[PDB]
Amino acid sequence: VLSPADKTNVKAAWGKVGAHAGEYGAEALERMFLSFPTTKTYFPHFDLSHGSAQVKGHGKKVADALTNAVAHVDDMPNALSALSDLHAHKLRVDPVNFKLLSHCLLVTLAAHLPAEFTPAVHASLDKFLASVSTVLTS
Amino acid sequence: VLSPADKTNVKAAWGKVGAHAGEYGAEALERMFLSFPTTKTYFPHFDLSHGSAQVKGHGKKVADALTNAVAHVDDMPNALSALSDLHAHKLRVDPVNFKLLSHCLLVTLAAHLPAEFTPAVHASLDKFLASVSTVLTS
Amino acid sequence: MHLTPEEKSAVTALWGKVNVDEVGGEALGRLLVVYPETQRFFESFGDLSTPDAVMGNPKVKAHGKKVLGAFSDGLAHLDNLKGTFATLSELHCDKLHVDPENFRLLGNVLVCVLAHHFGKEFTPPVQAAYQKVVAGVANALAHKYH
Amino acid sequence: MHLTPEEKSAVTALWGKVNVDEVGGEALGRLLVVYPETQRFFESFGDLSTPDAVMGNPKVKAHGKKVLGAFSDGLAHLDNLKGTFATLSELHCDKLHVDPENFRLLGNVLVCVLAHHFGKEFTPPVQAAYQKVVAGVANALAHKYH
Numbered sequence: 073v074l075s076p077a078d079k080t081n082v083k084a085a086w087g088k089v090g091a092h093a094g095e096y097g098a099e100a101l102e103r104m105f106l107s108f109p110t111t112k113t114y115f116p117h118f119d120l121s122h123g124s125a126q127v128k129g130h131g132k133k134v135a136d137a138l139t140n141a142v143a144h145v146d147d148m149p150n151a152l153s154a155l156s157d158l159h160a161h162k163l164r165v166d167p168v169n170f171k172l173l174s175h176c177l178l179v180t181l182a183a184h185l186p187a188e189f190t191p192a193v194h195a196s197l198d199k200f201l202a203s204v205s206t207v208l209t210s
Numbered sequence: 211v212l213s214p215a216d217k218t219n220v221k222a223a224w225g226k227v228g229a230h231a232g233e234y235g236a237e238a239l240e241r242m243f244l245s246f247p248t249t250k251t252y253f254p255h256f257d258l259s260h261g262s263a264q265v266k267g268h269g270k271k272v273a274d275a276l277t278n279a280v281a282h283v284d285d286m287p288n289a290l291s292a293l294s295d296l297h298a299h300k301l302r303v304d305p306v307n308f309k310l311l312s313h314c315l316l317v318t319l320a321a322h323l324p325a326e327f328t329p330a331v332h333a334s335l336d337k338f339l340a341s342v343s344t345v346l347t348s
Numbered sequence: 349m350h351l352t353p354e355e356k357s358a359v360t361a362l363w364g365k366v367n368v369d370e371v372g373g374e375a376l377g378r379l380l381v382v383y384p385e386t387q388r389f390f391e392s393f394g395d396l397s398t399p400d401a402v403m404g405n406p407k408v409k410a411h412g413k414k415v416l417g418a419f420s421d422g423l424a425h426l427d428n429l430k431g432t433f434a435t436l437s438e439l440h441c442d443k444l445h446v447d448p449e450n451f452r453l454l455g456n457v458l459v460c461v462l463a464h465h466f467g468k469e470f471t472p473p474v475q476a477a478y479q480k481v482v483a484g485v486a487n488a489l490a491h492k493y494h
Numbered sequence: 495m496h497l498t499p500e501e502k503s504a505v506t507a508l509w510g511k512v513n514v515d516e517v518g519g520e521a522l523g524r525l526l527v528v529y530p531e532t533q534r535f536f537e538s539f540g541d542l543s544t545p546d547a548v549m550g551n552p553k554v555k556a557h558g559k560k561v562l563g564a565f566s567d568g569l570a571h572l573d574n575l576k577g578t579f580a581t582l583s584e585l586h587c588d589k590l591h592v593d594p595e596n597f598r599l600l601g602n603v604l605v606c607v608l609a610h611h612f613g614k615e616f617t618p619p620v621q622a623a624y625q626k627v628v629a630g631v632a633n634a635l636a637h638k639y640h
């Protein structure tokens with residue numbers, strides 16, 4: 073579950089991300105593809121090279137979905153509904169892959185948010201990404 | 211998630227298990243301990259030798275809790291709460307291990323109930339064990 | 349493949365009694381019924397709408413036999429599964445785009461199929477030996493994903 | 495462990511700027527705060543109830559330095575990780591009873607901490623290399639479990 077303190081931490085961290093969310097989502101995908109190559113099997117119709125615009129374009133959509141999840145932190149299962157049908161029933165993305173993308177987002181955020189990525193906030197983000205992953209996978 | 215037909219498949223198969231439930235739970239434990247030795251790290255105070263008595267006795271406990279789950283398939287969270295607090299908050303069993311025990315239980319059932327272990331029934335029992343695991347790890 | 353000699357001996361002996369036509373059709377059939385998500389890779393096999401449809405599908409049965417064939421080949425190659433499954437690995441990765449997590453699912457369905465056919469002779473020790481084989485095969489198939 | 499020459503360079507290059515004392519403290523500390531289930535192994539460390547109690551705990555900092563020095567040993571012997579960690583593996587299994595899944599949690603908390611500390615410098619290709627290393631060290635710590 074997300075406690076009140078957790079929600080606050082998440083709002084404040086995503087808050088500081090602001091306009092750079094799309095680029096972070098993009099970096100997170102490149103990190104994932106390079107560090108865990110099996111994830112590319114879900115994107116065989118993408119151009120997965122460095123700087124690929126398809127990848128930048130996709131990174132932006134992932135970050136908007138996360139922004140929206142944060143905006144609706146008290147009703148994520150319903151706010152992410154459409155995205156849950158896509159991932160779990162159309163694409164059939166195996167749950168382990170969500171853990172790999174979440175880890176990669178945490179690495180991206182840490183690399184860019186030195187002063188806000190404290191132990192407590194890191195625990196909160198991790199829990200939020202788990203909650204987003206559970207919804208998308210259910 | 212569990213459908214009525216799944217619920218139906220699970221009551222029948224389990225009712226076939228009948229008085230062997232205990233014998234089956236213990237077998238499933240011994241299969242787990244030999245096939246997946248890392249699970250033994252959660253039982254350092256047990257005699258784990260073949261056919262030993264803590265395992266047997268423990269086999270009865272697992273099999274009875276499943277008996278109860280089946281009986282209360284429609285409201286497991288409530289029926290299992292106490293086992294949930296035990297496995298999730300006191301023992302802190304990493305979820306991976308639940309998939310390992312479930313597999314071993316399926317192997318056992320299939321080894322003993324050949325005629326009842328059809329594909330549709332294999333499918334429902336696997337969804338059933340995954341639901342129980344979900345309850346016991348959240 | 350760390351298999352004790354009494355383990356290799358256990359695996360080999362049971363495997364020589366296996367009816368490949370039956371087991372192979374059953375293992376592949378059960379993968380798609382028990383784990384419907386795998387149906388997306390076999391749209392071309394036809395009607396997979398019901399358990400009964402899947403288990404009688406002649407394309408499902410034929411491809412199962414080919415899969416067990418590949419598995420027999422690894423059994424006689426236990427020292428170099430890596431080399432034994434390299435091309436198959438590249439195919440599963442570059443041509444079919446199968447997430448290697450799916451290899452585990454098939455390995456476990458296959459273990460459940462052996463237990464179902466051999467009953468009491470599929471003892472805990474035999475199971476354990478086969479879990480090792482089945483993991484090694486999964487790992488071998490994943491090795492060339494890039 | 496398939497470590498190309500470039501990956502190794504990158505890895506080694508990177509490690510040479512790491513203050514082991516401190517990174518260990520942070521790594522073990524974040525493990526216990528982010529994944530509180532792993533506190534059940536350190537009940538003798540005293541107060542672990544809040545983030546500050548954990549991160550500033552002197553016993554946590556001392557243990558973290560110990561873990562990281564061993565990690566250090568591994569990087570100096572990347573081509574024999576199993577031999578290097580063999581006695582630590584048996585210890586964690588026979589005496590400490592640690593589920594090897596926990597080794598992966600720690601491996602990833604470390605990747606996050608390296609990224610925290612080095613920011614920019616921790617590029618994707620560098621992360622990929624470190625992910626191979628942490629997986630390698632976790633597999634080697636796991637090998638003697640029985």
Ligand code: HEM
Nearest residue numbers: 111114115133134137138155159163165169170173204208
């Ligand atoms: C944080 C968790 C994730 C979120 C929030 C997320 C979000 C999204 C969004 C917004 C879309 C686009 C929807 C649209 O354009 O209609 C999408 C598509 C997609 N996602 Fe995810 N995703 C996540 C994780 C994953 C993972 C783990 C995978 C597989 C490794 C994945 C694979 C895909 C694929 C293959 C598509 C379709 C891409 C295309 O054809 O354009 N996603 N996701």
Ligand code: HEM
Nearest residue numbers: 249252253271272275276293301303307308311342343346
């Ligand atoms: C279907 C899934 C499982 C069910 C239904 C189940 C059920 C139970 C039951 C009924 C007990 C006894 C509780 C009591 O004394 O009142 C128990 C205890 C325990 N379970 Fe499970 N369990 C499951 C899975 C697991 C797994 C995956 C693990 C880890 C491998 C595990 C480890 C333990 C341990 C260590 C105990 C304590 C044993 C003792 O201290 O005597 N369980 N479980």
Ligand code: HEM
Nearest residue numbers: 386389390392414415418419436444446450451454486489
């Ligand atoms: C881990 C055990 C597996 C083995 C040993 C294996 C091996 C094989 C073999 C021998 C072929 C035929 C190659 C040929 O005729 O040239 C094949 C094809 C194929 N495999 Fe597998 N495979 C395994 C698991 C899976 C998994 C789990 C899936 C997906 C869930 C899968 C998806 C496919 C597909 C889609 C084909 C082509 C089938 C067709 O002709 O439509 N394989 N594989």
Ligand code: HEM
Nearest residue numbers: 532535536538560561564565582590592596597600631635
């Ligand atoms: C990279 C992975 C790890 C390495 C290299 C490592 C290394 C070590 C070392 C060097 C010791 C001291 C051994 C001794 O006392 O003789 C130790 C002890 C210990 N380790 Fe690990 N360790 C790792 C991961 C973990 C994890 C993930 C856990 C549990 C979550 C854990 C639990 C323990 C415990 C409870 C002790 C003894 C602490 C005490 O003195 O009371 N280790 N580890």
